[PDB]
Amino acid sequence: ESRIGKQPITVPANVAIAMEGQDLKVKGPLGELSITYPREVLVEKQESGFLRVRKAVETRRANQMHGLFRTLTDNMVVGVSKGFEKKLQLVGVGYRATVEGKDLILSLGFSHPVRMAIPDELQVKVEENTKVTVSGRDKSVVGQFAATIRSWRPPEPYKGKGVRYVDEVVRRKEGKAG
RNA sequence: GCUGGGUAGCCAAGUGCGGAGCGGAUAACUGCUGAAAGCAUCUAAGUAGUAAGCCCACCCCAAGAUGAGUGCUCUCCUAU
What we know:
Elements: H1 61-81, E1 86-91, E2 96-99, E3 104-107, E4 131-134, H2 140-152, E5 162-165
Antiparallel strand pairs: 1-4, 1-5, 2-3
The protein binds one RNA strand of 80 nucleotides through residues 1-7, 36, 38, 60-61, 63-72, 75, 138-148, 150-151, 154.
Family: Belongs to the universal ribosomal protein uL6 family.
Keywords: Chloroplast, Plastid, Ribonucleoprotein, Ribosomal protein, RNA-binding, rRNA-binding, Transit peptide
Protein name: Large ribosomal subunit protein uL6c
């Protein structure tokens, strides 16, 4: 009954499929990844472009785990090819996010500017000093480091100050009790 | 006997020193990816921040730790 799982997995152009025993070796054009799979879930390669994954109705991983697994390789395979990106609008008085080599320098106005270290493989675009957008590969490992920048100053309820999700509509409560 | 001084020792009111870690796992909490439930959701797989609290680390003891550990070195002649 999985309405995401019933949909076949779109395998785009230049998808390097391979097996490491139980893992699906997702190594497209830009690099490499790793995805492990249980004994109750055999991922089929049905010899017709598309891909669908097997169930095993003893527990209800047949219901639920195929939400993760049949959407993991949706984003893992695309992720190596294109890459998923998350966006950051910084708003306020003197909010620079310049980049000196490896680390960032977010000078939000604490005292010492905040040097968020750029991790192993990922790279980050920088629209201006005023705005940033983090490119990458996967959806998971990009989102954590993206969320760490949003953590330093959340979107605040009076001026909409500090960091912002570009998509998110954060409220502005009536400041000064006006 | 009563006073006035006082080296060493012992004493403080005197002199030194101390409380430190970008180490680990957590609690409330904030999350990322993400179904069940085409959407959502911090969770059911996985994972990140994250406390004078908990565990290592500091300092003293410690193999009677009968589970008696490990290392280096010395000694085994006779009435002595």
